[PDB]
Each structure stands twice: as structure tokens, then as C-alpha cells.
Write a protein that binds this ligand. Structure first.
Ligand SMILES: C[C@@]1(c2cc(NC(=O)c3ccc(C#N)cn3)ccc2F)C=CSC(N)=N1
Length: 379
């Protein structure tokens, strides 16, 4: 009840490949590493020997498997998985001491879904039923967990990272050792993705003076399943233009800002020429907001596997989007993030583990006065 020591440090991963938790599926239990994804709502796992997979769900061995006799084709903007739907017994060894009958999509075909060299063989969609495939009748895992057990309807994520990353996913609660200062809550605007409303943006304290509605076009979401802070092209333009201006003692190729090239130094990174980035999020109270600030340490990520270079090369991990803002790993790694489903809100605090230097720190600050925040939501 504020201390979940068993669950601390239960996230593992590799830079650029995401965070995974260990899960078991079936009877007797088959252990699998499962990507933690707040951007989708399906629990889907490798079920055939795709050569990139360390292991896979073997239904024939599970005595508790049930077939739903339904299939599902799930495409993304590059590329896809296809699966056979069913149920089985699932548990999280370094999570609550419980077993749950949940929906499972057994992946039988894919393209560009499994990553070569990755050490995970499935995905845990933790978002809501509205975006479940094939439809909202297919209950997501977390919903099933809460319904069948006494686990409270809340989880929290401390994505730390830095070739291997680490973190904690606290199921059913909050662990206070994971954050400093105070949690600040922003409303979940609708229960499909974890949608939130950005009401103001600053670069090094400087506003952007954009219609806040632009910031949330057509959506702003919190997503552990994406690396980048992804922005709508308009906001991206204004953002980069400002980041360029804040940054203009060094010249960088246009391709770097566009994610088309890496930039390398040899630990001689001029972190301090790079501005901090602040997003004000709708608060809990009318005309009240709060501020989250990330460092260049978050949006400039080291690219490990460059055979062609002996130096330290970095990627600009702020990119343009057509699905609205994606608050991904670049954002979340600054913070302890509480997905308070019970109260339709998302909490942020400074991560006890976030990476910084002796000059600037990731911050969560409040309160602020911000009028017309409702007009910031897109309809
Ligand atoms: C379901 C999915 C998805 C997400 C991912 N996630 C990742 O590979 C990934 C990689 C690095 C990081 C980080 N940090 C997070 N996620 C892979 C496949 C996939 F289909 C679709 C697009 S974006 C999203 N939220 N989830």
C-alpha cells in the first residue's frame, strides 16, 4: 500500500526496443517476455517459431487453453500481425500474487512486428477496450485482472533506461520511492487510448503562442510503446524552429532535425546548447494546469549500433505525426507516471531514476493559471 518491493525493477529492455515484463501463460505456466504498451489494448503473443523469437506460446501444452474460434488481422502503418483468439491463465511473476483468465491472441503470422535481436515475444496492450481488435467486446488484460481479482484499478510506470534499459511497472498501486516531490494529475479525456490535453508548450521557457488546439490535433496520448515525442507537423515545425534558435551556436544539417541522419560527438556532447521542453497539461481543477519539463538527455538518444562510426552518435527523437501528439519514452523516462484508471486521470512526478546532469533536472511544477483549456481539445 505504497511499497511494492516485489514489483520494483520488474522492467527490462534494450535501447530502442522497449520495456518488457515477464509473464506466464497457460497451465503449466509458460514464461514469456512481454512488451509493455499503453498505446494498444490487445494481449498478443508469438505462437509459432518465427526465427527472431526466443520462445513462443505453445497452446498444445496448455491444459487450460480455450479456443474462441475467431481470428484477427491487425495492421499498423508498417506492418502487421495476425492471430488466433482464445483464453488461458495468465500471471505476472513479479506482479500481484494472482492468476487471471484473459484473452490472448496467438500470433500465427506477422511482418515487421517482432524485432530481430529483441528479447521479447509478445505485447501487453494496457489501453482501453474501445481500441481493442477486432472490437470492444474483446476485454483487455487489465480489465480482466481487475474484474477477477482485488487488484486496484491503477498501475504505474517508471521507465528508466540507461545497451540495456530498466524500470518498474507497479500493478495495482503506487510506490513512493520511485518519485520525488509531488504527483500531479491530468484528466484522461476519453477511455480509448490514454488521451490527455496539452494546453501550453514552452521551449526554454519561451511559449510557442500556437492555438493550443493544434497541440492536440487530433489526439494527444501517453504511450510506452513509442520511443519518440511525436508532434503534429505544425507544432513540430514551430518546436524545431525554436529548438534551432535556442541551439544556434552549433550548426546542424537539416536532415538531423528530420531524423534522416545522426549527429556524432566523441562524452563531449554540448547538452547545454540544447533547450529544455515544457508541456503544460490540463489539471484537475477549472483554469488550473501543471508543467512537465524534459531534458535534451530525453529527446537526444544515443544510437549504440553504428559500425561505421567510432564516436558517440545521437538521434533527434522529436518527430512529426499525423495521429496527433505521442508522449512516448522520450516523455515518460523523465517521470513516474501513474495510470489512475479508477479516477480517469494520469499522474506525473519527477522520476527518481531519470538521467540528468548537475545543472538541469526534469521537473513537475504547479499550479498554473490557464484559461480556455477546454478549447484545446480537438473534436
Ligand atoms: C502496437 C504498437 C506497437 C508498438 C511497438 N513498440 C516498440 O517496438 C517499442 C520500441 C521502443 C520503445 C521504447 N522506448 C517502445 N516501444 C512495436 C510494435 C507495435 F505494433 C503499434 C504502434 S505504436 C504502439 N503504441 N503500439
Amino acid at each position: 500500500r505504497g511499497s511494492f518491493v516485489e514489483m520494483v525493477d520488474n522492467l527490462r529492455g534494450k535501447s530502442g526496443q522497449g520495456y518488457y515484463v515477464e509473464m506466464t501463460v497457460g497451465s503449466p505456466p509458460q514464461t514469456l517476455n512481454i512488451l509493455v504498451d499503453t498505446g494498444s489494448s490487445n494481449f498478443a503473443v508469438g505462437a509459432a517459431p518465427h526465427p527472431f523469437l526466443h520462445r513462443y506460446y505453445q497452446r498444445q501444452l496448455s491444459s487450460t487453453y480455450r479456443d474462441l474460434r475467431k481470428g484477427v488481422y491487425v495492421p499498423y502503418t508498417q506492418g502487421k500481425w495476425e492471430g488466433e483468439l482464445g483464453t488461458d491463465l495468465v500471471s505476472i511473476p513479479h506482479g500481484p500474487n494472482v492468476t487471471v483468465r484473459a484473452n490472448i491472441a496467438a500470433i500465427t503470422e506477422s511482418d515487421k512486428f517482432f524485432i530481430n535481436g529483441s528479447n521479447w515475444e509478445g505485447i501487453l496492450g494496457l489501453a482501453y477496450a474501445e481500441i481493442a481488435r477486432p472490437d470492444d467486446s474483446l476485454e483487455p488484460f487489465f480489465d480482466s485482472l481487475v474484474k477477477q481479482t482485488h487488484v486496484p484499478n491503477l498501475f504505474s510506470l517508471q521507465l528508466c533506461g540507461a545497451a540495456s534499459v530498466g524500470g518498474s511497472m507497479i500493478i495495482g498501486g503506487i510506490d513512493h520511492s520511485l518519485y520525488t516531490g509531488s504527483l500531479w494529475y491530468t484528466p484522461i479525456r476519453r477511455e480509448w487510448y490514454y488521451e490527455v490535453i496539452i494546453v501550453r508548450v514552452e521551449i526554454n521557457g519561451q511559449d510557442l503562442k500556437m492555438d493550443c488546439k493544434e497541440y492536440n490535433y487530433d489526439k494527444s496520448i501517453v504511450d510506452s510503446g513509442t520511443t519518440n515525442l511525436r508532434l503534429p507537423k505544425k507544432v513540430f515545425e514551430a518546436a524545431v524552429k525554436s529548438i534551432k534558435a535556442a541551439s544556434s551556436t552549433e550548426k546542424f544539417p537539416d536532415g538531423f532535425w528530420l531524423g534522416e541522419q545522426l549527429v556524432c560527438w566523441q562524452g563531449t556532447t554540448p547538452w547545454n546548447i540544447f533547450p529544455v521542453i515544457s508541456l503544460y497539461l490540463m489539471g484537475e481543477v477549472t483554469n488550473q494546469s501543471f508543467r512537465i519539463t524534459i531534458l535534451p538527455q530525453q529527446y537526444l538518444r544515443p544510437v549504440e549500433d553504428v559500425a561505421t562510426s567510432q564516436d558517440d552518435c545521437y538521434k533527434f527523437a522529436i518527430s512529426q505525426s499525423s495521429t496527433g501528439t505521442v508522449m512516448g519514452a522520450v516523455i515518460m523516462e523523465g517521470f513516474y507516471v501513474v495510470f489512475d484508471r479508477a479516477r480517469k486521470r494520469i499522474g506525473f512526478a519527477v522520476s527518481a531514476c531519470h538521467v540528468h546532469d548537475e545543472f538541469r533536472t526534469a521537473a513537475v511544477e504547479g499550479p498554473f493559471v490557464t484559461l480556455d483549456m477546454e478549447d484545446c481539445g480537438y473534436n
